[PDB]
């Protein structure tokens, strides 16, 4: 009945993630004072955290509690597709956020005229399409599959939902969905910092964004590191820690609304909807 | 430059096809030219073979007759292949840089991991990724714009203009060209710093460098005016687009020339030519 306490903490995180990110989306929707361009990209980020609290983690919980997949081969693949799309769309969006800031800070005039809200939406949409293209389709086209006896065994057990991939796909996709967008964000972000210094409230906002980014990297990097190591030497790091780290990635989805508590704005808008 | 340019243009199809067919055959004869690096060179020559046999010949009928003569589907397949090949090339050049850099700083781990079977896997992974970001948005019509101008071009089968929306135009460019480019350069610069700090291998590295420089010089213009049409669609004249685009095609004819720098290819080109 260890199953019962697990369904309690699990149910609890789903609550954090879902409540916190609905609060964000609603606060920004409420105040137009809170409606800036930056916050448009933040909403995009919130939505990807929502999908996780609503779809990814719920089914993911059953998998960890029962050590087996109850939902069938098709939903297994679908679930996996969704999981990957959400992490790709996050880091891709954090990228945009950084580059957006770096442009506003260096080219303030050429920035205001070119950058409206209709375009940020067009940009958000393009990140989700790019994210769908590089991480949803391939999984749904079955390119991730291995040829190994053990792999084929898994693909035929509706109870097995191990993301057992071929090594080509393991490298290509971690680089393409995570590493590249990560490097880019790290670089562009560093630059924004130097610029902000060569300029010394706006900074508190810039710092919050850096924190959002830094926590993202800490929460997900262990998993993508372990991912590559595995490609080289399959039995050098224990399956359970593989799972531990992926859950650290999932938990990130609840840290954002928490971090936004640094703001007076977000602090006075968080308490208007919770009724105080 | 006008007599010169004119001759080159009357010779490109021949120059690209015969020259790349020739690179392929040389690498496949002289087992002394059979090395990991040269397998990537071969992938690079197939990208070029395809440009020489499918892309350029049909593009020639278009620029000359002034109209698309083959139907709207062949038009969208054509644009597809054209996008594929640029994408596969610059990705393959990326892999060639990373491969060399790694063969030069971790040579043991390099000799132990990198094999021919492995390299082939890497080639196909690259071609796969390339069809993904080039064929697939075309088959889902993600490239299409809403403008009546664009719309009349979609009805005219005799019109094969690649009129795309701004979202697509920027994204497909960042993804097919600029990112792979930025990586290839940062990596090639690292490899230069290593080959330097380290002093016939440097002659083979200098050719790889020339291949990567000429590729950049040949395509960067076309992608620059491509970002410019995004800002203002009237700010740059069609003729300048055609020229820059053909500058890039002509790139498919340069490589075999450049390899004549090596004595092995030269030797082997001459054997092959009776
Ligand atoms: C239960 C599973 C394993 C589905 N969790 C997936 C993880 O949340 C997201 O992991 C990934 C995200 C993007 C790209 C990826 C990736 C894993 C691999 C691999 N090879 N490539
Ligand atoms: C005649 C046409 C116009 C068909 N030539 C296409 C060009 O050779 C290939 O250009 C491209 C290569 C890769 C990615 C690209 C791209 C053009 C765009 C755009 N937007 N995205
Ligand atoms: C982010 C998307 C990454 C996609 C990577 C796809 C990799 C396929 S590898 C390789 O392809 C060959 C066919 O071309 C098959 O014959 C081999 O059996 C297979 O192992
Ligand atoms: C996306 C990139 C985000 C970059 C964020 C930079 C935030 C800088 S806060 C600033 O830092 C100074 C030291 O540099 C301190 O002395 C100040 O007291 C403090 O207010
Ligand atoms: C590997 C194929 C690359 C094709 C590039 C051009 C795609 C044009 S859209 C494509 O046109 C077909 C014919 O109309 C339809 O049958 C398909 O459903 C549709 O998606
Ligand atoms: C690597 C290339 C990425 C391109 C990403 C997708 C396009 C974002 S804009 C949008 O996409 C539609 C639906 O597909 C078109 O029908 C519309 O007219 C167009 O305005
Ligand atoms: C990364 C893609 C950015 C696209 C900006 C598009 C503005 C389109 S206005 C119609
Ligand atoms: C990515 C593969 C190509 C990286 C760049 C390779 C070519 C330059 S190496 C460089 O060439 C010089 C002459 O120009 C020599 O004098 C130096 O000793 C040597 O170190
Ligand atoms: C604009 C955000 C950058 C995401 C690029 C995706 C990487 C694919 C290139 C190989
Ligand atoms: Na299964
Ligand atoms: Na047409």
Relevant terms:
homodimer, 276 residues, mainly alpha, Rhopdopsin 7-helix transmembrane proteins, binds Cyanopindolol, binds octyl 1-thio-beta-D-glucopyranoside, binds decane, binds sodium ion
Give an account of the 3D structure.
- The structure is a homodimer.
- With 276 residues, the first copy, chain A, is mostly helical.
- Chain A has a single domain, classed as Rhopdopsin 7-helix transmembrane proteins (Up-down Bundle), CATH 1.20.1070.
- The first copy, chain A, is built from ten helices and no strands.
- The longest helix of chain A has 34 residues.
- The two termini of chain A are 39 Å apart.
- One octyl 1-thio-beta-D-glucopyranoside binds next to helix 3 and helix 5 of chain B.
- It is classed as receptor.
- Keywords: GPCR, membrane, receptor, palmitate, transducer, antagonist bound form, integral membrane protein, G-protein coupled receptor, G protein coupled receptor, thermostabilising point mutations, phosphoprotein, seven-helix receptor, lipoprotein, 7TM receptor.
- It forms a dimeric assembly.
- The entry is titled "turkey beta1 adrenergic receptor with stabilising mutations and bound cyanopindolol".
